Homo-oligomer: A and B are copies of this chain.
Amino acid sequence: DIVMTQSPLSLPVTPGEPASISCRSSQSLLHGDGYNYLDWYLQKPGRSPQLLIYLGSHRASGVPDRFSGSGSGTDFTLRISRVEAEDVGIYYCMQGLQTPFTFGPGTRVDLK
């Protein structure tokens, strides 16, 4: 299969400064015709996971304009323009190229 890593494994955040989390992958996730196949998922404590970023650097419905993605090849970064007090939880990194689907260990983000 494919093995994923995240960095860091713990990142406290302050209400008013940006933040960045990096997902690193195995052999390139880049498809053919175009576009990557990596996604960023969010999960609040107790509720059900909600999609945050899909297909690298796009956004779905909802997800107010302070989340973004960047990167090409094997390293990707999720960046928060201006974090708020409602972004505590766990972040997950997902692939979509082959089908031994694997999720990342999960990065914990809490308020400082």
- Contact of A50 with B by CB under 8 A: no
Main DSSP-derived SS at the A contact region: loop
Chain A's interface size range is: 10 to 19
- Chain B residues with CB under 8 Å of A27's CB are 14, 16-17
- Chain B residues with CB under 8 Å of A18's CB are 28, 30, 73-74
Could you give, for residues 74-111 of chain A, a 1 whenever the CB lies within 8 Å of some chain B CB and a 0 otherwise?
Answer: 10000001100000000000000000000000000000
In chain A, residues 1-48, which have Cβ atoms closer than 8 Å to a Cβ of chain B? 14, 16-18, 27-28, 30, 32
Task: Give the 4 A-B residue pairs with the shortest CB-CB distance, closest first.
Answer: A17-B28, A18-B73, A30-B82, A16-B28
Apart from A16-B28, A28-B82, A32-B82, 11 more pairs, CB < 8 Å: A14-B27, A16-B27, A17-B27, A17-B73, A17-B74, A18-B28, A18-B30, A18-B73, A18-B74, A30-B81, A30-B82
